Coordinates of C-alpha atoms and ligand atoms in Angstrom, one line a residue:
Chain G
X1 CA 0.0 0.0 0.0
X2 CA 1.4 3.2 -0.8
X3 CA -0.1 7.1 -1.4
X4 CA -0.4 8.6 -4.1
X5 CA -1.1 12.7 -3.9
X6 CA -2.2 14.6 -7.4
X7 CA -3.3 17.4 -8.2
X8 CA -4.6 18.3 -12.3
X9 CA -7.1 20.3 -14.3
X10 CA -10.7 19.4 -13.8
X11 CA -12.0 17.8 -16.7
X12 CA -13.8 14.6 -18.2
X13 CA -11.8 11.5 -18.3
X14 CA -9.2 12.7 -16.6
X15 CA -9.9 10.2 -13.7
X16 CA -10.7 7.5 -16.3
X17 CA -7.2 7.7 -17.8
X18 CA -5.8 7.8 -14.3
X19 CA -7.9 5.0 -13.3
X20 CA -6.7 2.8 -16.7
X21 CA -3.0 3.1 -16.3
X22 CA -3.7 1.3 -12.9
X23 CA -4.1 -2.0 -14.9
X24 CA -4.5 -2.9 -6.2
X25 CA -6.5 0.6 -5.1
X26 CA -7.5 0.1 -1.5
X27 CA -8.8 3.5 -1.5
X28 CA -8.8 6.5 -3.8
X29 CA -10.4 10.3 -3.6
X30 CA -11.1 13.0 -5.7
X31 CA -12.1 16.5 -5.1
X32 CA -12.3 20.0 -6.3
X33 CA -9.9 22.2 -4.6
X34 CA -12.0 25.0 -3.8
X35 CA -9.4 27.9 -2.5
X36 CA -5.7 28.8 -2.2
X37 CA -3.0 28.4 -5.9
X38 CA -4.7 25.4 -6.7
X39 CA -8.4 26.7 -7.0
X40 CA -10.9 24.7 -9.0
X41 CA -8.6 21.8 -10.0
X42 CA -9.2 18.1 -8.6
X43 CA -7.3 16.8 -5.7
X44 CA -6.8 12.9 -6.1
X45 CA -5.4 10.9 -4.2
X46 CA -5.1 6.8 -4.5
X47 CA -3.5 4.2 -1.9
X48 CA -2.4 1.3 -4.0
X49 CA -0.8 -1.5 -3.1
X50 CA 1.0 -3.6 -5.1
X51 CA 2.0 -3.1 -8.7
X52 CA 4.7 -1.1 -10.6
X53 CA 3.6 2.7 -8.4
X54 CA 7.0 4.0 -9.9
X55 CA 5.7 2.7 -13.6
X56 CA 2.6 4.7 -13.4
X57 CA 4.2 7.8 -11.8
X58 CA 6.3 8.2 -15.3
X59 CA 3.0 6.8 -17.0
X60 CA 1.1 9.5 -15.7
X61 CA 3.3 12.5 -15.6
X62 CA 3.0 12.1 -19.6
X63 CA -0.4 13.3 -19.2
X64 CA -0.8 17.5 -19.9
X65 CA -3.4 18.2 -17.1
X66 CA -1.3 16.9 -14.6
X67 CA -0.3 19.5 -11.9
X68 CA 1.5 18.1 -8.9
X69 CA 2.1 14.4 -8.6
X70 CA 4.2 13.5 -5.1
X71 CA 3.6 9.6 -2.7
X72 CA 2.4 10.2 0.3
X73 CA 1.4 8.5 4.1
X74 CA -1.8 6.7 3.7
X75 CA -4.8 8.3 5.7
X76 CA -4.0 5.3 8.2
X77 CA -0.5 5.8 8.9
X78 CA -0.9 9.8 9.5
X79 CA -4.9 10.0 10.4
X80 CA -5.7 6.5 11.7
X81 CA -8.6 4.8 12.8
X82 CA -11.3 7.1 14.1
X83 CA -14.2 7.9 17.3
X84 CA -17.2 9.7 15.9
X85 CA -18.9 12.2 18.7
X86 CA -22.3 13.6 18.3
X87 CA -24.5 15.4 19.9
X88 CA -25.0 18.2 22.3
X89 CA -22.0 20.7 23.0
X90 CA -20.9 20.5 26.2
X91 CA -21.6 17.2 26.5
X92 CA -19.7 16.2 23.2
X93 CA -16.9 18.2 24.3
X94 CA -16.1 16.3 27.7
X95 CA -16.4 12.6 26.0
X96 CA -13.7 14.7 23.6
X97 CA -11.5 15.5 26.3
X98 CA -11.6 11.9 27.6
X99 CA -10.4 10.5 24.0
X100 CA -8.2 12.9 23.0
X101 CA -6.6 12.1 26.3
X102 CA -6.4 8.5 26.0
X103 CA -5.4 8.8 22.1
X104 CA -3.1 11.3 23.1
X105 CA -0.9 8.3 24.8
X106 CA -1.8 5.5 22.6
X107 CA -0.7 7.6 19.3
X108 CA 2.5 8.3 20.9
X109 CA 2.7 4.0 20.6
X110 CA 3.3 3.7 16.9
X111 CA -0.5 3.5 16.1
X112 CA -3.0 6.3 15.2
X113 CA -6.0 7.2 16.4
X114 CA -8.2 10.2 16.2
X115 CA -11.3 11.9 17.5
X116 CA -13.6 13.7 15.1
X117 CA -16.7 15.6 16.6
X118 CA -19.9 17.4 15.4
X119 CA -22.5 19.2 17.8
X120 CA -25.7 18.6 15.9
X121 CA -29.6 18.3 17.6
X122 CA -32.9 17.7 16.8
X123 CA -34.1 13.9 16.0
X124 CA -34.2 13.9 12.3
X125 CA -30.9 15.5 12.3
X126 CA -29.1 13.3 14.8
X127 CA -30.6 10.6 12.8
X128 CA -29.0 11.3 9.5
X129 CA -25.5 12.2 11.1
X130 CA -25.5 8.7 12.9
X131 CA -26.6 6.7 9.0
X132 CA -23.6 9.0 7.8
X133 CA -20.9 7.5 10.2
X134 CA -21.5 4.5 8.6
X135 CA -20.2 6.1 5.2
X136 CA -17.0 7.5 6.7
X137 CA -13.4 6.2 6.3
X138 CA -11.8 4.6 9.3
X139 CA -14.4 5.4 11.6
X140 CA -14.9 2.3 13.9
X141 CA -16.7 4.0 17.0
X142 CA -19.4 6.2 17.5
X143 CA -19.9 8.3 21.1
X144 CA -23.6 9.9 21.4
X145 CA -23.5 12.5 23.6
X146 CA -26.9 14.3 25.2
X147 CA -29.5 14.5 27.4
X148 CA -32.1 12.6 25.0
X149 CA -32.7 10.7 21.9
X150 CA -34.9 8.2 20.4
X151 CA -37.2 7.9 18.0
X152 CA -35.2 7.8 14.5
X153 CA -31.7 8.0 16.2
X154 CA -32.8 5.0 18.0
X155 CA -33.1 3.0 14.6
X156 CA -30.2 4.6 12.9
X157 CA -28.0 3.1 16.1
X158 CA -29.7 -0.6 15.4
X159 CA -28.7 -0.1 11.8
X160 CA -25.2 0.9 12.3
X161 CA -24.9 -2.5 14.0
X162 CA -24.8 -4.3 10.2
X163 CA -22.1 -1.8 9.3
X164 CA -19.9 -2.8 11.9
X165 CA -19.4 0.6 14.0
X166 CA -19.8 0.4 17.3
X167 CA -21.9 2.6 19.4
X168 CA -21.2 3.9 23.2
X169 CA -24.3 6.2 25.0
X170 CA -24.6 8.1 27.5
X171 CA -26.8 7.8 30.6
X172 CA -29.0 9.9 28.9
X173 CA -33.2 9.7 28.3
X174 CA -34.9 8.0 25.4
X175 CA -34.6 4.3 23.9
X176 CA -30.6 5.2 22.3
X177 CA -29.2 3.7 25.6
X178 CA -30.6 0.5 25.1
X179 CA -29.5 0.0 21.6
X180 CA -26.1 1.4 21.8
X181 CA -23.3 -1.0 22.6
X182 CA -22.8 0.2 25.9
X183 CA -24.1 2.9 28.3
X184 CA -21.6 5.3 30.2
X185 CA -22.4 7.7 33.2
X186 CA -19.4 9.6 33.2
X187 CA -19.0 11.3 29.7
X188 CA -14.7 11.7 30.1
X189 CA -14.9 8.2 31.0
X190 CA -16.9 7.2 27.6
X191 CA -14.5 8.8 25.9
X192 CA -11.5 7.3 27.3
X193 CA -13.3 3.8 26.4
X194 CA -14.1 4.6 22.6
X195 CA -10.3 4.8 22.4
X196 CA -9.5 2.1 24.4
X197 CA -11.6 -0.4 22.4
X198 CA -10.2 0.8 19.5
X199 CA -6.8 0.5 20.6
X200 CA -5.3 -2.6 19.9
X201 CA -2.5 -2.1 22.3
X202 CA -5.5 -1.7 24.9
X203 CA -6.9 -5.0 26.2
X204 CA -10.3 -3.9 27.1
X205 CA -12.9 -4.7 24.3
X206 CA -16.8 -3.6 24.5
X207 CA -17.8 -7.3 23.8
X208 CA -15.4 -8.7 27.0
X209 CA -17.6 -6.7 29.6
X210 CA -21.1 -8.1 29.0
X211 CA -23.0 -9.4 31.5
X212 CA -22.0 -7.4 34.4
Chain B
X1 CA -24.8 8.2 -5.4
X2 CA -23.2 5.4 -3.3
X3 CA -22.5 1.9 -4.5
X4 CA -21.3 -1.6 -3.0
X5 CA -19.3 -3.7 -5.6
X6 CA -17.1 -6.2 -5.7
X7 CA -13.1 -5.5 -4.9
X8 CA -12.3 -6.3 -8.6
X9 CA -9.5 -5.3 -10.3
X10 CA -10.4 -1.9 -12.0
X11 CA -13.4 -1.5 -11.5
X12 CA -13.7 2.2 -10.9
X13 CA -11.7 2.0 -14.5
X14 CA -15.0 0.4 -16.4
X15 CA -17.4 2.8 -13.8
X16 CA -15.4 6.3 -15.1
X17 CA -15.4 5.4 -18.4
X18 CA -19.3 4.8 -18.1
X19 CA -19.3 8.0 -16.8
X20 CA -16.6 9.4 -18.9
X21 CA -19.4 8.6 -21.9
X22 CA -22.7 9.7 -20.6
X23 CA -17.6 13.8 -11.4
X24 CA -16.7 16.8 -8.7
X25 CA -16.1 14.7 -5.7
X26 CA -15.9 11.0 -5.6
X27 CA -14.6 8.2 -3.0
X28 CA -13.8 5.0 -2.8
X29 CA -12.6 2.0 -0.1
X30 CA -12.8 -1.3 1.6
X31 CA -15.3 -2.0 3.8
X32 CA -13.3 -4.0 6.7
X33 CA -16.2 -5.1 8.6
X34 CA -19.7 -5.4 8.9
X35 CA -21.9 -7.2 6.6
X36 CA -20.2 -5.8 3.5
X37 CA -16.8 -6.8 5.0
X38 CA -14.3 -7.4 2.2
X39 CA -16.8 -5.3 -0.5
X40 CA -15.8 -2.1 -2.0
X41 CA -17.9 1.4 -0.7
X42 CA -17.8 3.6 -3.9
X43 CA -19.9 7.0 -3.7
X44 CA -20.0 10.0 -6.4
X45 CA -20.7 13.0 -6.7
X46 CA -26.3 6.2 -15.9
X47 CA -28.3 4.0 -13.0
X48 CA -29.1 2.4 -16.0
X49 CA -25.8 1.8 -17.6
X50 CA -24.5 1.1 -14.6
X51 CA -27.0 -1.5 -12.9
X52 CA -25.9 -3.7 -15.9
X53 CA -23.3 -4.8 -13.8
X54 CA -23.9 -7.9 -11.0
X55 CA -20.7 -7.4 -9.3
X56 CA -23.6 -4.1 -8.3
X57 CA -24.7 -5.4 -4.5
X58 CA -25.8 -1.9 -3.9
X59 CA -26.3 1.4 -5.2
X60 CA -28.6 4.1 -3.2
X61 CA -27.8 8.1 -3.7
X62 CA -26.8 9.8 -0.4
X63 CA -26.8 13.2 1.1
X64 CA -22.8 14.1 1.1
X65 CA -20.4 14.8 3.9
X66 CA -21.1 18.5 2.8
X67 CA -24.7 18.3 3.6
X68 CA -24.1 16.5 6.9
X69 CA -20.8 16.9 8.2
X70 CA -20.2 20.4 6.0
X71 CA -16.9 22.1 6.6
X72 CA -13.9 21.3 9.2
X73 CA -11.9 22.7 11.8
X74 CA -8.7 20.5 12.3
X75 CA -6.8 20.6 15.8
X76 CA -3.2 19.2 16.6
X77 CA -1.0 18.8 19.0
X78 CA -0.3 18.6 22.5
X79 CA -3.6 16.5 24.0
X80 CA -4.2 19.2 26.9
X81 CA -4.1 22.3 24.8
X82 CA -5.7 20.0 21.5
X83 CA -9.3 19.6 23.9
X84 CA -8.9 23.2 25.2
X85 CA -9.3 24.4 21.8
X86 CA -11.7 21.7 20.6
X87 CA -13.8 22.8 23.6
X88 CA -14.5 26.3 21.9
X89 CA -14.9 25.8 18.7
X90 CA -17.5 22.9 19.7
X91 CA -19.3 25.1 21.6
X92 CA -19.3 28.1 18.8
X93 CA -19.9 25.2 16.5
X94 CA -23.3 24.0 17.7
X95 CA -24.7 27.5 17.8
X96 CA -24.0 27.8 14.5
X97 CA -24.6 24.5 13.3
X98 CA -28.3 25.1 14.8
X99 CA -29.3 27.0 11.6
X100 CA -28.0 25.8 8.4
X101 CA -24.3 26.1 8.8
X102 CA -22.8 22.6 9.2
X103 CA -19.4 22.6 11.2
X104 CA -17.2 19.9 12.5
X105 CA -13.8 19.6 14.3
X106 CA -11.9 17.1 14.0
X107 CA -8.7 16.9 15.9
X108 CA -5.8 14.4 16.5
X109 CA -3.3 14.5 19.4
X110 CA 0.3 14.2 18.3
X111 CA 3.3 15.2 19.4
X112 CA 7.4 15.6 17.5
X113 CA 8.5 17.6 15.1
X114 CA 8.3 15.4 11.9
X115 CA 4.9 13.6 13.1
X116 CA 3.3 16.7 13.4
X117 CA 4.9 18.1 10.6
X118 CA 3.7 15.7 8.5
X119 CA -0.1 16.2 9.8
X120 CA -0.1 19.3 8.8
X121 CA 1.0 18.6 5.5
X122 CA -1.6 16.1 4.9
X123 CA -4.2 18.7 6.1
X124 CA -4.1 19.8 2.4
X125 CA -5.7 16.5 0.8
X126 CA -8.7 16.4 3.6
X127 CA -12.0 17.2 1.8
X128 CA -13.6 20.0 3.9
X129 CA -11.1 21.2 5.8
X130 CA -10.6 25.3 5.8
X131 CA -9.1 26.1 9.3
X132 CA -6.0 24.2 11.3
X133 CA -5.4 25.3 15.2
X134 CA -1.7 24.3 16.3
X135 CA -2.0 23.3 19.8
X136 CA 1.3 22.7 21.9
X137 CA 3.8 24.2 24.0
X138 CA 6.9 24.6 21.5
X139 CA 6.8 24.0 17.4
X140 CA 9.2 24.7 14.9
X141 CA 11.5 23.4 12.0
X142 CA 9.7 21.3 9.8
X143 CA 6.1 22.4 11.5
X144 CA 6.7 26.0 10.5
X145 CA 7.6 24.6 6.9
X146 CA 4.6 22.9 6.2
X147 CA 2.6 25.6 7.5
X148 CA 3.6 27.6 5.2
X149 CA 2.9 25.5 1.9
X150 CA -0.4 24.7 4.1
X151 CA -0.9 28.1 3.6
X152 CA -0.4 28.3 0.0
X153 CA -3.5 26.1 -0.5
X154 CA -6.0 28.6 1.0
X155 CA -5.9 26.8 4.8
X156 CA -5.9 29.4 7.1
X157 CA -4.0 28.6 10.5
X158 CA -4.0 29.6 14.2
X159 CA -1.4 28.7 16.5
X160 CA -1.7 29.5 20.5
X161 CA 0.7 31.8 21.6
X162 CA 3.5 29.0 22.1
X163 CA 7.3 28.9 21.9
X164 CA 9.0 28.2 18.6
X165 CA 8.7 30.0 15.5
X166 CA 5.4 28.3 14.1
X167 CA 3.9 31.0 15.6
X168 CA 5.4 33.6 13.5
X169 CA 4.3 32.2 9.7
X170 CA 0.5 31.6 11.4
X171 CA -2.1 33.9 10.0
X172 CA -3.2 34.7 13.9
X173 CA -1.8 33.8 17.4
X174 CA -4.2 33.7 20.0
X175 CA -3.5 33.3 23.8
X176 CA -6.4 31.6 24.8
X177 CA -6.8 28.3 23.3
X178 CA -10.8 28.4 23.9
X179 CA -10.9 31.3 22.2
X180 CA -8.6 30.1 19.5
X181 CA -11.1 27.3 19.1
X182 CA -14.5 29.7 18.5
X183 CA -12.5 32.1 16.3
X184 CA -11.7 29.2 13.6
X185 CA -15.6 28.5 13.6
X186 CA -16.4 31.9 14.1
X187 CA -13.7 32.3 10.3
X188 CA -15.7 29.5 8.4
X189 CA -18.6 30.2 8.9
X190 CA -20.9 31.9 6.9
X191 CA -23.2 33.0 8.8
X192 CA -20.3 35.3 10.8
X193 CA -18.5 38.1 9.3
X194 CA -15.4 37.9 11.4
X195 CA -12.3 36.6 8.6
X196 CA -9.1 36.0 9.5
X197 CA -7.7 37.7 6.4
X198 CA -8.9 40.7 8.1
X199 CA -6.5 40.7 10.7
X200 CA -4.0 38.7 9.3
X201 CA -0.6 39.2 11.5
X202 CA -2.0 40.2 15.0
X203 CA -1.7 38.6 18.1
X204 CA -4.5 38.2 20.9
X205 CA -3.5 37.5 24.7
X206 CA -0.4 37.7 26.9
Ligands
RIP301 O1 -15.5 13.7 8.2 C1 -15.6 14.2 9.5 C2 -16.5 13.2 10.4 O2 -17.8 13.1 9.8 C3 -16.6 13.7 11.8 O3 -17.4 12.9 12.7 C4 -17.1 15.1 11.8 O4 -16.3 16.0 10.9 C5 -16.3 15.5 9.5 O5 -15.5 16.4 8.8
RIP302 O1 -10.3 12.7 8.6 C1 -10.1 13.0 10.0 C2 -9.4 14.4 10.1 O2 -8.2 14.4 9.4 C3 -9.1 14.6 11.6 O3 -8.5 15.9 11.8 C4 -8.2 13.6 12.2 O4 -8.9 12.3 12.0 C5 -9.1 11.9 10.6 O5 -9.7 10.7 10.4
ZN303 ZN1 -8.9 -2.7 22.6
ZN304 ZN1 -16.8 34.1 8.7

């Protein structure tokens, strides 16, 4: 696996010829940059592994709508793997300061972890945000922070469950306790443990503490 | 419009030249668990042309992270100082997030020179992202380098008022790290007119 940064003009095909001369992509991107030198030409980026990279750097630096072409750290080796907070301000803010804590230690061990938040309310809102996580790279655990939810959220959480993410609730009102994963009081605490079952230098594991 | 495949070999190379016939933002990885574990998650931004295909297990068109997670605010650094700024521009964040405006900040403890250095670098290829905090005690060398080719690509950046000379190429220093956290929300978005072009240089706090 290795990453692959460029940068070129956006037009049609241009991803397709890109996309040819690589004939493994684990993961690829493409976007619009839309300020700074580079405005209104296409980021992409690929993460291939295995295959002749060096081959299709020359290959593609043939091509005249090529900006910047440069390898790169994959997303997993810089970024990592990542806990998803939503919910409420305050409260999403001290589940933060419990998992930026305890990645804080963990990422000085070789591995990468990170904590991505959003403060957003309202059920239908909530709802859509929690089907999102689902779509997100490296996100593996999902902290709901507030004082209440149900309804859609509720069936969003039970859904998440086929995606693999987990989920970890607060002691908070509505039926989204009983279908997360697991239900914490103390909100640093739930974020500490987000990290800690994501951790694989951590031996704590949401599925080792049922029953209790 | 999101899609569940098959891993194949090139296959995005038979879906872009569909589309290359009949894309601003487009992604593409492997789903390493769940029920499509081992599968390919493909999502653009031809149903017809396209559906043709069996290696197709799914294929339903979604909102975008633009729509749902909108813009970002990225934090790194020290993990104290990281949370102090995460918890203001949270806070600023869900009031304006309550109308429109869709904020999120992202953030990722790290600490050394070239680790951190290279974060910031890779700031430039995350979709979204319009405003990086530095949060530490003391950065320099290559930090200060990449903030300033982070620069060039229209990320603004706002360092605490550490020791080191990142500091000096960031496009605001402010002393209070909660502070430093609503300002970079308050800077994206829209719905405020504070801009940190229009102060570029000054420093806020002892
Ligand atoms: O992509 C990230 C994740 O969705 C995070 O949970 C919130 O911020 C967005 O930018
Ligand atoms: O994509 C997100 C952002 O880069 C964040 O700043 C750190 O975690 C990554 O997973
Ligand atoms: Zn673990
Ligand atoms: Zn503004």
């Amino acid at each position: 696996l290795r990453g692959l940064r460029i940068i070129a003009e956006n037009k049609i095909g241009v991803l397709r010829d890109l996309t040819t001369i690589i004939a493994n992509i684990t993961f690829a991107q493409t976007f619009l940059i839309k300020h700074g030198e580079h405005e209104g030409k296409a980021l992409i980026y690929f993460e291939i592994e295995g295959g002749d990279f060096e081959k299709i750097l020359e290959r593609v630096k043939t091509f005249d709508y090529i900006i910047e072409i440069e390898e790169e750290e994959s997303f997993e080796r810089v970024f990592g793997k990542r806990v998803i907070i939503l919910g409420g301000g305050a409260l999403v803010s001290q589940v933060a300061i419990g998992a930026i804590s305890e990645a804080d230690r963990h990422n000085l061990r070789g591995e990468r972890i990170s904590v991505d938040t959003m403060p957003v309310v309202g059920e239908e809102e909530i709802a859509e945000a929690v089907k999102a996580v689902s779509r997100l790279h490296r996100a593996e655990v999902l902290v709901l922070a507030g004082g209440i939810m149900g309804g859609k959220i509720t069936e969003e959480v039970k859904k998440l469950r086929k995606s693999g993410i987990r989920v970890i609730s607060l002691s908070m009102f509505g039926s989204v306790p009983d279908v997360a994963d697991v239900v914490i009081s103390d909100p640093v605490m739930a974020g500490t443990l987000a990290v800690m079952h994501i951790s694989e230098k951590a031996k704590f594991d949401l599925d080792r503490v049922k029953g209790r």
